[model samples]
Target: PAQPADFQAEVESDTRIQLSWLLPPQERIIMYELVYWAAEDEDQQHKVTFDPTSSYTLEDLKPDTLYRFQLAARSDMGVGVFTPTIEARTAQSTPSAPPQKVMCVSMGSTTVRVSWVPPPADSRNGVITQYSVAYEAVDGEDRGRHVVDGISREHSSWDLVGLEKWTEYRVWVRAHTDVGPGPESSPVLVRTDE
Candidate 1:
């Protein structure tokens, strides 16, 4: 057996990746052994053996996480040295759920404050890059819709100004990543102070 070379990986999706390699030309390769795992969990390694192929696709991986993989060639005589280890991160995905527990409070005669909590980790699917806030007047002569995008992920609260005094409004929030926006949270209703 001879060591494999040119090992490379491509991120296919949030939960899948493709790996390929070149076997040494002179070796009589019979099969290959693949070992992979989340980069943070050495104790949870996984292994697979398959007939010689230039590529393989790993499935059921966690989204937006780092992982490591290694490959080695096997022949009638013995197994060859494992290829140098490689690492990659899975692709980002849209949040599985909307932001949670959204609330709004009037800050003044024409200002309101909105805040929310993010969905649980599993539902977040990927890193939250930002938040989207949409609001509209529910009761008033000047009913109108407004949207705010690219709110920082680090902050959960936003001050909404230029609202009508003592007027009722409805607001909703959603999380976002590079992939796309998640579902919007249930609308929160509030009224500005007079």
Candidate 2:
């Protein structure tokens, strides 16, 4: 019985990798044995097993680390050796905290403006460069809505449009720079005047 197939793997995030393969009709897969070795320690092999399934997710991986893996298939007939090894690296960075100060003001009947100042740096080397304004409508137990993007340091206002008059809403802001967005400011609740 000739069973030909292909193997593919990818890093889903900093801590997980996803793999998929197609099972051949000529073979009845019982289990799959995954053999992996970190790029830095190729002599040591870590092995795991999985039942016949469409896909497998490998978790608990170290961030920014390179990993190489190979797979062997087992069936009622016997074990099939791996075709070739594949490798991928994890994400290099994690999400960082944003600014702590955020303020909101009512600008018009249907709009609310948001503003924030970044925390001061003693060295003045890493000043906060931008701000992100996010908001959500409070209607019938709906989830909080939001948006994120870079804005100039001098521009702290956001004209929220298409808002219902006399309706209560919640908004917030966070400052950021080349490093990343800062911790989000406290949520501000306001109402559009009728």
Candidate 3:
């Protein structure tokens, strides 16, 4: 005779969830199943399978949402019933909004100085924190990535380098804090066609 399986779950975010369970005493446990729901909607229950391992990760989910999850075990005898379900919430708050008022200045043949306004509202007191600037070549085969951290409340200057002389490029900025990162700023398209 087999006993009921015991299960537990912890949801880290909307797209990342973890589940663990204890199988009923059996010689060989074959597989396990995970059932989840984004909200209290019973119609949205979904099931995923896993090895008889202790835990699993549920990825590719919508961020900043609530989720319900459960687990069940199976063996040669039959499929065991599901364990008790649990719920979790993801961090969906957009901490950083797009950068404002971008201006680009040609520094040299392959470099430009870009600047922008600070975030609309410093929600985290004076802690504006890190920034990531991403750019891609317009007609060439080169891309650029930069990270600026320990930024003061009034710091808003970025130097674009390693660009082709006769190519255009797109640039943007994003902010991050201890809480999370903000969305990327609007794209500013520039070309060094001199």
Candidate 4:
């Protein structure tokens, strides 16, 4: 049998892709094989054989990513030539990981400096549009204050001003996309200068 033809991919969701192709004529075909890889991690690949279907949907894929795929018809003679590959981009979703390297340091009696790196590139389903900084007072049971959730910076850094003096505060930073924010980072404790 000849290779599969007219292969195409459709985005089903952020984590799924619906693929279909024109099956070869009623030749001595036993099965079908498909191979695919993500553009973010081309070294990693996956292959699957179907009992002979013209369409299949891939699942558990990374959101907002590029993927390449090929299809072929397998037979008893093991003579299956792959079709020309096709590429598609998955839909975007919210971030999947927290910010990295969050740090906080007291600047003086009533101010603290906070900084962090964005979430991992692949874990960020879409472009990070902003960041949020949450600062809490460890002395009292107060939840403390949070930024406006609109700090747009790759090198996320800001001063937590007008805080309680000589007090310990726990700080965390989280990233955001057009969809929503990710989980908050682990807390960083800092004590203000007396």
Candidate 5:
């Protein structure tokens, strides 16, 4: 039995990682064993056995969490020494849902206060880094598209400014993280005060 070598890991998705390694000498090797767990919870370790394929993708892992993995070769005699533990963290996931309950709280000739609640915790996937607000006049001579990015995640409300007076507009927002932006919230319709 011999230890696997040249081990490597790469993020495959928010909840998956692809691992690869070079098999040791083939004559005595029978198979390979993989052991893995979240870095914070050694007690929750998991194991998998596979043939000599050079790669495997671990799935159903938590997003934005560090994980450790070990690989070893096995022979008829017994398992070989484990390779040095390797660590990798899954990519942060996009929000699973758009901002919820988006609406206009107040409106004036040139500004509208829009607010909403963040998506449910389970649907957040990872920490919300920011929010993106998009708006456009529904139908007017100055119908135009506009966007506001980098809204602090700490604040769920925003004062949308530079809006036209006495105009109908469609507005929506979406959550974002390092990974990417989530689906946009359902559009909210509002008319600015004349």
Candidate 6:
């Protein structure tokens, strides 16, 4: 029994990883076996049995995630030892959910302090590399936006200054990755202090 030769895999897209390998050294190729899973779910696995094929296209994988894979062969004697795992990371995608708890407080007569919690580990399709905060008065033309990057806190905040006093401003925020921004949160209407 022997392992497959020259095995390899690569991220084909956000949802698939394509793996390829040559046959084992022996000629009695009864079958081949493959197993793989995401970085966090080792017990929850995906197993495939190939009918003397040299390649497999893994499907429905999580976007922007690392996956580990292994390969082995079966012959007249028995199944061989599985090869050491190889790893690859998929491409990024837009966040599935907006930033959470988008709240705004009137900081002063002409300022508003906005804060939020980021999307959860599951909803963010990729690392949240950037954030955008926006606010505009409901019945006026004064609009403002702030874009920032790499929030280090489990919670973070930003302040919008020089806003019109006593104005009813609609504020919202969204999360972004390398791909693009996601949907914005529900607007929090907060009036500036009189």
Deviation (Å) of 168 in candidate 5: 4.2
lDDT of 5: 0.86
By lDDT, the candidates rank as: 1, 5, 4, 6, 2, 3
**Candidate ordering by TM-score (highest first):** 4, 6, 1, 5, 2, 3
Q: Write the per-residue lDDT of candidate 2 for residues 24-49, one digit (tens) a residue.
A: 76467788888887897778889998
Question: Model 4 TM-score?
Answer: 0.86
The C-alpha RMSD in Å for every predicted model, in order, reads: 2.8, 11.4, 9.6, 2.3, 3.7, 3.0
Misplaced by over 4 Å in model 5 are 1-16, 40-45, 53-63, 79-84, 92-96, 120-129, 139-141, 164-168, 178-180
Supply every candidate's count of residue pairs whose N, Cα or C atoms clash at under 3 angstroms: 0, 8, 1, 0, 0, 0
Off by over 4 Å in 6: 24-28, 141-155
lDDT of 4 by residue, 1-194 (tens): 57878899999999999998876677778988889998778888999988877789999888988999988887878857888889999988888899998888778887888888888987999888899898778773455575557788655798887777877888878888888888899988888887
**Candidate 3 vs. true structure, TM-score:** 0.47
lDDT of 1: 0.89
Which prediction has the highest lDDT against the true structure?
1
Q: Residue by residue across 64-121, what tens digits does model 1's lDDT show?
A: 8889999998899898888899998998889889888899899998899999998888
Residue 146 Cα positional deviation in candidate 3, in Å, after optimal superposition: 20
Better candidate by TM-score, 3 or 6: 6
* Tens-digit per-residue lDDT, 13-47, candidate 5: 88989999875555577888999988878888999
The 10 consecutive residues of candidate 6 with the worst lDDT sum are: 145-154
TM-score of candidate 6 on Cα atoms, chains taken together: 0.83
Name the candidate, 4 or 6, with the larger lDDT value. Answer: 4
- Candidate 4 stretches with Cα past 4 Å from truth are 24-27, 140-145
| Distance from true location, Cα of 78 in model 1, Å | 5.6
> TM-scores of all models?
0.80, 0.47, 0.47, 0.86, 0.71, 0.83
State the TM-score for model 2. Answer: 0.47
* Per-residue lDDT value at 151 in model 5: 96
Candidate 6 lDDT at 41 equals: 76
Query: In candidate 3, which residue ranges exceed 4 Å CA deviation?
Result: 1-4, 12-14, 40-42, 92-178, 184-194
Give the alpha-carbon lDDT of every model.
0.89, 0.69, 0.67, 0.84, 0.86, 0.82
Report the alpha-carbon TM-score of model 5 versus the true structure.
0.71
